[PDB]
């Protein structure tokens, strides 16, 4: 009989950021550290 190959790849090769929502606010630059350090 034929056999299955069980894949479970969750963590994917890292390799324009998400576009901000349309709100009436001045553009605010996020802290430099928050842009050079990966997500927590």
């Amino acid at each position: 009989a034929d056999t299955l190959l069980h894949f479970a790849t969750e963590s994917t090769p890292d390799g324009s950021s998400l576009s901000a929502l349309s709100l009436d606010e001045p553009f605010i630059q996020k802290d430099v550290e928050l842009r050079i350090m990966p997500p927590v």
Binding site: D2, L5, F7, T12, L18, S19, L34, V40
Partner: protein, 507 residues
């Protein structure tokens, strides 16, 4: 010491009119850098902002307060203040707002916290943020949906409980609808990432597959966005082992076979893996794959893969599935030879090949051997000697005793014997097999307790025994005693082959 302390008191005023007016000025100050920083530096102020937001019944106040937190969320000190002031619970509640503005401020603020504030993930989970975010997937603003789905990806990644909550909330269905509905790349990408993380959970798979996820993801396989295409493939591959019974994979299968010719390794790897699973025990899928040149496409993939076992193993398994149990199985066995696959198939039996690939390759060869026209080519490529080597080596590890390389040497034993069993249908092959002093080993295998081994051992002996010389050699090897016992096996195959060897030896 001037505006902040005062506005703070005003925000806590008992009269809402004074409160609402304060909310407007506070929001206004949050738009300016100097006063924004001043606001985030006041524990009492941020705390009053948060309390006011989650308690006010004035849409205008709810907008200015959420807008304020939103502005504070661009700075580490702001994010920390929001977090310490019970911000998360308040923001999650605001996700239920009927006001778009409030909703956008809230999800943006929560997203910024999940991205840069340690401890936010647990807090959001705790506050029941997962359920609301999933419930918001029926909204239609694509930028909003992108941020929301991104929040889910962050919360579900590596966390099984969050994945189940998304499931219980109806996440799969809603996410698949997104893939099937929009064209905004950023949304498709983030959404395909959530499905990917969820496809890792064996409990989420059925939900996603039944919702038509295989098709929804298949839809973007030729999109200009490589990250979109690849994430859809990762997800499809994770799901494939749970979608082998799905009807309507014809369209996807065509695209997948085409993807085998990609220059991108990750694309080819996934295309092969998905094809192998979808061609597992599904005659309809096997026929469709053959129909669109799957045999040739897979042979080419294996050749291009070289020593990349991440590609050859699933491609070889696919070919194994395609060369068995279906209308076009035999034509498939023949086509592998026509597309020049025999040489590489036999090559895969040797190092650096690892056991998993070795087991799959032996299986394919067993199938290919069913086509008489492959007998000579396989012999000419050195299949027999090597198959014997693997058998001997495997048999020894069996008696000298489990999983090696993640493969049981008992499987190699019957796999190799099973392959030699079929190749022995050829006169020249029989000369080679017997010439390798194998008979003693085969007779030995008759004593195995595994019926499958017994069967394939009796099988090769039977084929070999059609030649007088070999028959007497088998008889002279003491096969009569063990065979006479197997003659009484409740296993049809064992008993039939056993009687056959005895009959042949007495002609």
């Amino acid at each position: 010491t001037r505006a902040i302390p005062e506005l703070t008191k005003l925000l806590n005023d008992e009269d809402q009119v004074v409160v609402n007016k304060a909310a407007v000025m506070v929001h206004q100050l949050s738009k300016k850098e100097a006063s924004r920083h001043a606001i985030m530096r006041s524990p009492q102020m941020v705390s009053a902002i948060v309390r006011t937001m989650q308690n006010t019944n004035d849409v205008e106040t709810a907008r200015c307060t959420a807008g304020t937190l939103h502005n504070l969320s661009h700075h580490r000190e702001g994010l920390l203040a929001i977090f310490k002031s019970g911000g998360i619970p308040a923001l999650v509640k605001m996700l239920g707002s009927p006001v778009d503005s409030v909703l956008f401020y809230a999800i943006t603020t929560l997203h910024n916290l999940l991205l840069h504030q340690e401890g936010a993930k647990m807090a959001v989970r705790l506050a029941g943020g997962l359920q609301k975010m999933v419930a918001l997937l029926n909204k239609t603003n694509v930028k909003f949906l992108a941020i929301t789905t991104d929040c889910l990806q962050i919360l579900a990644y590596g966390n099984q409980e969050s994945k189940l909550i998304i499931l219980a909330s109806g996440g799969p269905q809603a996410l698949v609808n997104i893939m099937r509905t929009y064209t905004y790349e950023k949304l498709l990408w983030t959404t395909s990432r959530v499905l990917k993380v969820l496809s890792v959970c064996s409990s989420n798979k059925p939900a996603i597959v039944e919702a038509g996820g295989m098709q929804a993801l298949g839809l973007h396989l030729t999109d200009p966005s490589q990250r979109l295409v690849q994430n859809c493939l990762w997800t499809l591959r994770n799901l494939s082992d749970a979608a082998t019974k799905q009807e309507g994979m014809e369209g996807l299968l065509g695209t997948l076979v085409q993807l085998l010719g990609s220059d991108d390794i990750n694309v080819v790897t996934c295309a092969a893996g998905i094809l192998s699973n979808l061609t597992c025990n599904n005659y309809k899928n096997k026929m469709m794959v053959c129909q669109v040149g799957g045999i040739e496409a897979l042979v080419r993939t294996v050749l291009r893969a070289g020593d990349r076992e991440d590609i050859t193993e699933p491609a070889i398994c696919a070919l194994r599935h395609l060369t068995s149990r279906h209308q076009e199985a035999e034509m498939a066995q023949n086509a592998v030879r026509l597309h020049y696959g025999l040489p590489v198939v036999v090559k895969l039996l040797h190092p650096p090949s690892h056991w998993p690939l070795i087991k799959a390759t032996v299986g394919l060869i067993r199938n290919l051997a069913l086509c008489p026209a492959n007998h000579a080519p396989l012999r000419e490529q050195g299949a027999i000697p090597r198959l014997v080597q693997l058998l001997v080596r495997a048999h020894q590890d069996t008696q000298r005793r489990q999983f090696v390389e993640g493969v049981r040497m008992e499987e190699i034993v019957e796999g190799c014997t099973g392959a030699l069993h079929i190749l022995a249908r050829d006169v020249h092959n029989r000369i080679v097999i017997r010439g390798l002093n194998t008979i003693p080993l085969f007779v030995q295998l008759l004593y195995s307790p595994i019926e499958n081994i017994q069967r394939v051992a009796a099988g090769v002996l039977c084929e070999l025994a059609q030649d007088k010389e070999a028959a007497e050699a088998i008889e002279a090897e003491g096969a009569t005693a063990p065979l006479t016992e197997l003659l009484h096996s409740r296993n049809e195959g064992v008993a039939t082959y056993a009687a056959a060897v005895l009959f042949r030896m007495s002609e």
